[PDB]
Amino acid sequence: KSKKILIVGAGFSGAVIGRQLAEKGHQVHIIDQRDHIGGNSYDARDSETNVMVHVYGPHIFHTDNETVWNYINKHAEMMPYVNRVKATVNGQVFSLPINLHTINQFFSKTCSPDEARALIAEKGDEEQALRFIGKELYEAFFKGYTIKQWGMQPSELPASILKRLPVRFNYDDNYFNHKFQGMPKCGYTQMIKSILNHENIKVDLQREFIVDERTHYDHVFYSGPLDAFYGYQYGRLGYRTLDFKKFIYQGDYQGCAVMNYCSVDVPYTRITEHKYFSPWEQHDGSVCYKEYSRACEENDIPYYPIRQMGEMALLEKYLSLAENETNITFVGRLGTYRYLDMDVTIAEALKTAEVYLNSLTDNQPMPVFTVSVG
Amino acid sequence: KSKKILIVGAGFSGAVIGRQLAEKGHQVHIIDQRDHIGGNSYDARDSETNVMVHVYGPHIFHTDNETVWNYINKHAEMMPYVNRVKATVNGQVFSLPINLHTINQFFSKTCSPDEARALIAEKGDSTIADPQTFEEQALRFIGKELYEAFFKGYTIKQWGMQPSELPASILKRLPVRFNYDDNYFNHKFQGMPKCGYTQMIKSILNHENIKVDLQREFIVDERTHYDHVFYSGPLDAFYGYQYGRLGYRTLDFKKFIYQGDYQGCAVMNYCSVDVPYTRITEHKYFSPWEQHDGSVCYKEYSRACEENDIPYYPIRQMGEMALLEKYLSLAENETNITFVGRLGTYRYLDMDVTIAEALKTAEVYLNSLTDNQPMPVFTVSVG
Numbered sequence: 001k002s003k004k005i006l007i008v009g010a011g012f013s014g015a016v017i018g019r020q021l022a023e024k025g026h027q028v029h030i031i032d033q034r035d036h037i038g039g040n041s042y043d044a045r046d047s048e049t050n051v052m053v054h055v056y057g058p059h060i061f062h063t064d065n066e067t068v069w070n071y072i073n074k075h076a077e078m079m080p081y082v083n084r085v086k087a088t089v090n091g092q093v094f095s096l097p098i099n100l101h102t103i104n105q106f107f108s109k110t111c112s113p114d115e116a117r118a119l120i121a122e123k124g125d126e127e128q129a130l131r132f133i134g135k136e137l138y139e140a141f142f143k144g145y146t147i148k149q150w151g152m153q154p155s156e157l158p159a160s161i162l163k164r165l166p167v168r169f170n171y172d173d174n175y176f177n178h179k180f181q182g183m184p185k186c187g188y189t190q191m192i193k194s195i196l197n198h199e200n201i202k203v204d205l206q207r208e209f210i211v212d213e214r215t216h217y218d219h220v221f222y223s224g225p226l227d228a229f230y231g232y233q234y235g236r237l238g239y240r241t242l243d244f245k246k247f248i249y250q251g252d253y254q255g256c257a258v259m260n261y262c263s264v265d266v267p268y269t270r271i272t273e274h275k276y277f278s279p280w281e282q283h284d285g286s287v288c289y290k291e292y293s294r295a296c297e298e299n300d301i302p303y304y305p306i307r308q309m310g311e312m313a314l315l316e317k318y319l320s321l322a323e324n325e326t327n328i329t330f331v332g333r334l335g336t337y338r339y340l341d342m343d344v345t346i347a348e349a350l351k352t353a354e355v356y357l358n359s360l361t362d363n364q365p366m367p368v369f370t371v372s373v374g
Numbered sequence: 375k376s377k378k379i380l381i382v383g384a385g386f387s388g389a390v391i392g393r394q395l396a397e398k399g400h401q402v403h404i405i406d407q408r409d410h411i412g413g414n415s416y417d418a419r420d421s422e423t424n425v426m427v428h429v430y431g432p433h434i435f436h437t438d439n440e441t442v443w444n445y446i447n448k449h450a451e452m453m454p455y456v457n458r459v460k461a462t463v464n465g466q467v468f469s470l471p472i473n474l475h476t477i478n479q480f481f482s483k484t485c486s487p488d489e490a491r492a493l494i495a496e497k498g499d500s501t502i503a504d505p506q507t508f509e510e511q512a513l514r515f516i517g518k519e520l521y522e523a524f525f526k527g528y529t530i531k532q533w534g535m536q537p538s539e540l541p542a543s544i545l546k547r548l549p550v551r552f553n554y555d556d557n558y559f560n561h562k563f564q565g566m567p568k569c570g571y572t573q574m575i576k577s578i579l580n581h582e583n584i585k586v587d588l589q590r591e592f593i594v595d596e597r598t599h600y601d602h603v604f605y606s607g608p609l610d611a612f613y614g615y616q617y618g619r620l621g622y623r624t625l626d627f628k629k630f631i632y633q634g635d636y637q638g639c640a641v642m643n644y645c646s647v648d649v650p651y652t653r654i655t656e657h658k659y660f661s662p663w664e665q666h667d668g669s670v671c672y673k674e675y676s677r678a679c680e681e682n683d684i685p686y687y688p689i690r691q692m693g694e695m696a697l698l699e700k701y702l703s704l705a706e707n708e709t710n711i712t713f714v715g716r717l718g719t720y721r722y723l724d725m726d727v728t729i730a731e732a733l734k735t736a737e738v739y740l741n742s743l744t745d746n747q748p749m750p751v752f753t754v755s756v757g
């Protein structure tokens with residue numbers, strides 16, 4: 001028996017689950033409220049300059065999971081790329097993440113790796129900060145950017161989210177540690193378009209999900225936000241949102257893909273020069289984005305989930321409501337209130353599809369979550 | 375018919391020429407005077423640390439030649455590797471080659487690209503029409519300050535001559551970059567063989583018709599036993615050095631071991647004329663996909679190549695070219711031999727270029743059997 005499957009969202013979670021089940025003969029309907037595919041991975045060529053623009057912010061693919069890598073390489077041509085981020089602060093330019101060049105340049109030293117460790121220990125001694133990393137360093141790259149990014153003081157408990165960056169005592173300046181890293185040649189929209197290209201998948205855009213639909217389907221995969229599915233009945237989960245002031249420059253505006261600004265007294269958080277994500281292409285005109293962080297309010301796009309104490313308690317109420325549902329599975333960053341990379345999203349969507357396909361063969365019930373959230 | 379073929383040397387020239395011929399039936403005999411294969415691309419693991427050491431200098435593979443890239447991908451697993459060189463000078467650490475980061479750190483600014491062009495244009499002297507020396511090239515395009523900080527001391531160490539005595543071409547190959555890219559090489563294909571260049575050359579050498587004899591010098595009486603000789607030893611040596619030795623710079627690699635990360639990168643240049651080594655290399659960073667606790671490191675020193683040193687860099691100025699002409703003039707009088715490779719032709723040649731020339735040289739000698747014509751002594755220009 002082919003099942004009727006509804007999928008809310010056509011980003012990676014939707015697309016990849018949809019393709020896995022379509023391939024096994026199920027009848028898949030995917031909807032999305034936006035006028036185009038790809039969720040926040042979506043990109044498109046600006047018309048004036050023809051630069052592939054990453055519409056919802058710089059998107060770099062990286063993973064240690066060889067299955068996912070192989071999986072995307074069937075849908076795109078991955079071009080080698082390494083993300084090398086720069087930062088402007090105190091009238092100097094630095095490489096990020098904080099590596100031995102940063103340390104030496106910042107303190108005007110010629111330290112070796114070990115000498116650097118000895119230097120940092122003694123400079124160390126908001127709270128993770130002053131013990132490990134010292135006054136002068138704390139204030140320079142971390143205080144100000146935090147404040148601008150999260151929107152609460154650094155005097156409000158860290159010890160998670162800044163630990164997605166690594167802290168090296170070598171001159172490696174690759175933002176990631178992952179084994180695989182690249183940039184699709186024709187962009188993530190075509191890679192997603194290729195994942196959606198199957199006869200058993202029907203896609204409708206500008207189509208909002210409505211609870212009244214549920215009963216026309218055997219199962220629903222929902223990758224929209226968990227609080228909205230329930231009418232926000234216990235309150236709205238906390239999200240930071242982003243504004244992007246776009247502009248055009250005839251030239252190379254900054255000389256790299258991403259320049260961060262660490263001083264608080266600068267309004268934007270970073271500027272991104274989109275053509276630097278396509279080194280294999282040449283462009284005279286340049287599309288650029290100044291990027292501003294705010295509190296998310298009911299009209300904005302939710303970007304990063306805050307996950308401080310309060311939002312966790314509030315999340316737990318929606319989790320326990322979701323636990324009593326029957327033909328639905330919630331997935332993705334928005335469905336589970338988690339900050340997820342593309343590689344982890346794709347990994348979770350393949351697994352979700354496999355558990356479902358397994359549930360039909362073994363005649364068992366499909367879980368509401370396929371990943372840990374509680 | 376199958377031909378009898380002597381190949382002198384077992385680096386890329388030997389291996390590649392000799393594999394193309396074993397593929398067309400020929401009886402290839404490859405000799406090398408050293409007790410291992412690989413020529414100056416030879417790497418080997420250090421006993422105590424297990425780090426893969428590039429024994430004759432760091433060797434990084436890079437090319438725009440897809441055909442060559444394919445070919446070595448047949449004989450090794452090529453790992454992605456981007457050479458990112460650092461430099462220590464004037465009490466600081468910089469990135470090389472000169473880029474927007476080096477410029478902004480050196481002059482203490484936060485220039486954009488277009489502002490850096492304007493900064494360097496004011497420093498350069500656009501009154502020099504056609505820079506002929508290394509010095510003139512640097513004063514024209516980067517200015518006195520950058521010149522003296524990053525190039526003068528270094529060039530003196532490397533070449534044993536003032537930069538006003540050295541050709542502009544040497545520096546022409548490194549234009550200033552006005553963005554933040556610090557990859558050393560502009561090339562499209564770039565990497566490092568996972569099992570190292572020895573295993574790679576071993577693979578090239580692993581064919582039915584090929585026998586390799588190591589610790590075996592060439593002897594002139596061997597010619598007679600073969601239909602043709604491919605020679606990639608030094609040209610002056612073949613002729614007994616009878617006119618003099620071709621000029622070379624040599625290198626001393628001074629080994630030491632550290633328990634940990636000694637410098638934190640593969641390559642660190644010392645640009646001051648007053649630090650005696652040109653650089654320090656830390657070989658494990660050439661294998662970043664591996665993990666090692668102990669590190670093999672080298673300090674490199676450059677000096678004139680003497681009678682018993684290994685020749686690394688050809689000098690190639692008038693006198694040396696005069697001398698070369700004397701050996702060319704009698705190489706031109708040989709009948710069943712072809713000089714190839716960096717040593718055979720007194721040129722510096724990267725790996726990809728060397729491999730391309732070997733493919734060409736094998737092609738040419740097959741092309742010339744089907745046409746019963748004479749195989750020339752060089753398959754490349756040398757005059």
Ligand SMILES: Cc1cc2c(cc1C)N(C[C@H](O)[C@H](O)[C@H](O)COP(=O)(O)OP(=O)(O)OC[C@H]1O[C@@H](n3cnc4c(N)ncnc43)[C@H](O)[C@@H]1O)c1[nH]c(=O)[nH]c(=O)c1N2
Binds near residue numbers: 061
């Ligand atoms: C600023 C920024 C920058 C980056 C990244 C995130 C952010 C916020 N990411 C993370 C990456 O964007 C993320 O993993 C993927 O977007 C997850 O894709 P999903 O399909 O799960 O959700 P995604 O959010 O993309 O898709 C949800 C889709 O469902 C639709 N939808 C929602 N509610 C609906 C409703 N009720 N009815 C109908 N449709 C609805 C939406 O329109 C949307 O299209 C990233 N990752 C990475 O690996 N490298 C990177 O560099 C970056 N860069």
Ligand SMILES: Cc1cc2c(cc1C)N(C[C@H](O)[C@H](O)[C@H](O)COP(=O)(O)OP(=O)(O)OC[C@H]1O[C@@H](n3cnc4c(N)ncnc43)[C@H](O)[C@@H]1O)c1[nH]c(=O)[nH]c(=O)c1N2
Binds near residue numbers: 591714
């Ligand atoms: C310091 C330094 C650093 C580098 C490089 C060169 C130098 C000097 N190279 C260049 C690279 O080394 C060069 O391309 C190859 O070694 C060429 O190999 P050949 O086989 O042509 O000569 P090669 O010199 O390697 O081999 C000649 C062989 O002939 C043997 N021989 C000589 N006389 C003999 C005799 N009479 N009898 C028997 N055997 C004899 C020798 O023992 C030797 O094995 C390089 N290239 C690159 O692409 N990337 C890089 O990073 C570097 N790095």
Ligand SMILES: O=c1ccn([C@@H]2O[C@H](COP(=O)(O)OP(=O)(O)O[C@H]3O[C@H](CO)[C@H](O)[C@H](O)[C@H]3O)[C@@H](O)[C@H]2O)c(=O)[nH]1
Binds near residue numbers: 058143146149258
């Ligand atoms: O200069 C910085 C940068 C980060 N942070 C802290 O560390 C976190 C870093 O998180 P991310 O860089 O991952 O934030 P983004 O999601 O916006 O970055 C996204 O865009 C980047 C483009 O360079 C990468 O692709 C990255 O992997 C992708 O998550 C920040 O939120 C902030 O808490 C700072 O204090 N200073």
Ligand SMILES: O=c1ccn([C@@H]2O[C@H](COP(=O)(O)OP(=O)(O)O)[C@@H](O)[C@H]2O)c(=O)[nH]1
Binds near residue numbers: 470524532544
């Ligand atoms: O820090 C440096 C690096 C290189 N060079 C000069 O540039 C030349 C080219 O050097 P490179 O290492 O780039 O290429 P290769 O030595 O392999 O030909 C050297 O001989 C030097 O004279 C320099 O002056 N300072």
